[PDB]
RNA sequence: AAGGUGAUAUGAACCGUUAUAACCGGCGAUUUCCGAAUGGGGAAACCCAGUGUGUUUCGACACACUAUCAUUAACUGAAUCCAUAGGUUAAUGAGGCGAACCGGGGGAACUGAAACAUCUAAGUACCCCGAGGAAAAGAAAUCAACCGAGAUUCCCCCAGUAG
RNA sequence: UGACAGCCCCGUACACAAAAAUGCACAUGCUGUGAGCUCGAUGAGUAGGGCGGGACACGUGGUAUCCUGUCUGAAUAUGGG
RNA sequence: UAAUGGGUCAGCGACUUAUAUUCUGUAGCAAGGUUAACCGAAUAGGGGAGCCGAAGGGAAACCGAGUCUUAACUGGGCGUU
RNA sequence: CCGACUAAUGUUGAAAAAUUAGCGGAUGACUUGUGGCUGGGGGUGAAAGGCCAAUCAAACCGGGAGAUAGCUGGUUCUCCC
RNA sequence: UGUGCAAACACGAAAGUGGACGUAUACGGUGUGACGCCUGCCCGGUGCCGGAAGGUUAAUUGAUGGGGUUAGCGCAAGCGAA
RNA sequence: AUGUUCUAACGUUGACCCGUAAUCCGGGUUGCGGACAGUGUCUGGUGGGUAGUUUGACUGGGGCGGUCUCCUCCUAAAGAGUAACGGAGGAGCAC
RNA sequence: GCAGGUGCGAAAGCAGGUCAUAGUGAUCCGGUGGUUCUGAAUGGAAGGGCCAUCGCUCAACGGAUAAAAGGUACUCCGGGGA
């Protein structure tokens, strides 16, 4: 899953960075914790 | 309803000019090394259905 | 019922086939799981009974679009 | 319209003959109780209510309302700060029945194969859901064969042919 | 109709008839749905694939095509069936 | 026959029907015959889409009163009168 | 009161399981009234394939249904070759 | 002999329910059948229990080889990338 | 890949709160498990627990025994053919 | 006996297995080689055909399936004095 970090995440990257995470990581943590948003734009 | 052709019969008999039926000879499918060349040669051409069997063949092929 | 709330996938029927081609009736069930979906726009978790395929659909379309489809369909959640 | 008060079915007591006798048609009125049955319950045709009104001669009495679900509103209103869930009220609709035809969800076996398992019977019988006066289908990501056709549906052929 | 009726009776051919309700078909009034027109747009967890089934006259066969329970997964008109 | 069935009577009780196919008879037409659905008020008329027949041989391409077999028949099979 | 070991009778019975003389249990793993629950490859069974409405090695009713029956029975007027 | 409790097990496409508002001195299954004296040898067969080195082995994955097609090389035969 | 740690999916037939007048359910708070368990699709094993079926014929009745195709002789009545669970032998190759 | 090609013989001639009579298995489904005969728009190809050939103690040997043993005294039906 390609996401857009809404903040700095350890091994992931920095705010703005668009990265590919396992769909589970994004759906059950990054997104519900405001730490990222899906790369649709 | 229409009579149904016996399909397996249609794959083994063809009607000739005077109403008889031609067929391929049996015994030329496999084990053939032991069979004499003369015997296999005489099995190659098609043959006519015999009088005894014409009734059976005709019953199987209403639309021939 | 064993119905995906997103896609409408439900059990369907078919045959087991043995090597001897004996046919016996069988069912194919959807890969259903009850999942808590975060709705950022509503600041709420919404639980849906969804197939894995419907999970992928929610990933592709966003939870808001799918919930709107469910509302338009009369499907309560 | 000169007759008439349905039948077994007489009788009785009456109605009527120039037009409110009867009879026939349209539109209306009345339409107990049970039954979806819907105020609650129930061993159908019964038992027992709550609210309003109105009446009482003070004993009482009459009438209307009150099921459930869906949707839409208004008000309200947790855990929990907003809120939501929830609660109540009102509006609108549904419910049940019905012979066949129709679409869909499921779906046999006897039987035939001269036994039997693939195959057959047959997507038939049956169960279930839903609709309409018909339903379904339908305006080519279709065929054709280098020529062309031009949505769907139904009939006759093609053909018991190609497979 | 006391036996078999054109002329006995009721009909029949034919010719007529509605206060009221109602079917349909016309017609033009209220009314909402909005015609023609240029530019533009052209249906994605989809087509397709792997696995299991089912449907196609077609039993997996050398088996196209359709549907999809499961896992995937494009082009998008210069593109696609 | 000491094998079966019937106590008796009356009434009922078992080779049909639809479609396809072949043969016989009969009728029509004849190298031709005949239409289906449908149209039509039409048992008429229209409708020849088709089907069967006048050519066969060969698995087939193909050839054709021939053709197939085979390198080829003195030939042989099926056909032609 | 609950049973049912023996015999006789009865056996188109008084009765589709009884009567008569005897017989066993009789404060218990007893017996009985009312109501309830378990449903057919299913129930229930101190187990006999017992019982599940006089029906049980798969209840009954309706349907598939005119299953199938290489078996048995039966198959109706006359005469001629 | 099974069963550590959301028990084993049973009814049930499931939710659940019985087991049990019980908890190994409990509960299910199996055989034996008061009591007395007892219950011997065999683990090769079948089952069950344990093991896990080595052989064999599913779906899955798709290295490698072969073929069909054809841009082109060719005059033809042919060869032949993606 | 295989360990270990983690929490956020998922489980909870732990606790407490609310809907609520409720040992259902749902929502909240929290603890304990935790990417396991469980479920879907596919797949190997096991599977009389259940189902559909098969289990030949001849035969001095059936069964048990024997036999089942082919060759030679005799029965076979001087052409051919000719039966018995009649009388005697062989083949399913070799080169 | 005819056509083609062949061996032995000087030649006439003989030779299409063996002194003869057993030594065997239909069809289907497929495998291998050859052969443009066919090739679902067309060119190919796949598949099919044709010729040669291979795979059955189908031995119950005209072979019913690719694939099959028992019990019934719990029994049941249709039949036979065959
Ligand atoms: Mg061959
Ligand atoms: Mg009621
Ligand atoms: Mg009521
Ligand atoms: Mg009450
Ligand atoms: Mg049969
Ligand atoms: Mg319509
Ligand atoms: Mg008279
Ligand atoms: Mg489009
Ligand atoms: Mg697909
Ligand atoms: Mg495909
Ligand atoms: Mg497609
Ligand atoms: Mg006598
Ligand atoms: Mg007699
Ligand atoms: Mg008698
Ligand atoms: Mg011809
Ligand atoms: Mg008793
Ligand atoms: Mg007594
Ligand atoms: Mg005593
Ligand atoms: Mg006593
Ligand atoms: Mg017994
Ligand atoms: Mg009884
Ligand atoms: Mg049974
Ligand atoms: Mg039937
Ligand atoms: Mg019958
Ligand atoms: Mg429990
Ligand atoms: Mg004992
Ligand atoms: Mg069995
Ligand atoms: Mg059967
Ligand atoms: Mg026998
Ligand atoms: Mg004997
Ligand atoms: Mg002789
Ligand atoms: Mg003689
Ligand atoms: Mg004789
Ligand atoms: Mg010799
Ligand atoms: Mg010899
Ligand atoms: Mg082509
Ligand atoms: Mg035989
Ligand atoms: Mg046989
Ligand atoms: Mg009997
Ligand atoms: Mg007899
Ligand atoms: Mg006798």
Curated annotation (Swiss-Prot), chain B:
Domain of life from the UniProt record:
Bacteria
Which key words are in the record?
Answer: Ribonucleoprotein, Ribosomal protein
Its name, as the record gives it, is Large ribosomal subunit protein bL35
Task: Respond yes or no to whether keyword Iron is given for this record.
Answer: no
Taxonomic lineage: Bacteria, Pseudomonadati, Pseudomonadota, Gammaproteobacteria, Enterobacterales
Keyword Glycosyltransferase annotated: no
Quaternary structure and interacting proteins, as annotated: Part of the 50S ribosomal subunit.
- Name of the gene encoding the protein in the UniProt record: rpmI
GO CC annotations on file: cytoplasm; cytosolic large ribosomal subunit
Q: Which GO terms describe its molecular function?
A: structural constituent of ribosome
Recorded source organism is Escherichia coli (strain K12)
- Residue ranges with Basic residues bias: 9-21
User: SUPFAM superfamilies from the entry?
Assistant: L35p-like
Chain spans, region Disordered? 1-21
Q: Name one GO biological process term.
A: cytoplasmic translation
- Here the disulfide bonds are none
Q: Which family does it belong to?
A: Belongs to the bacterial ribosomal protein bL35 family.
One Pfam family here: Ribosomal_L35p
Q: Which Gene3D superfamilies match?
A: 4.10.410.60
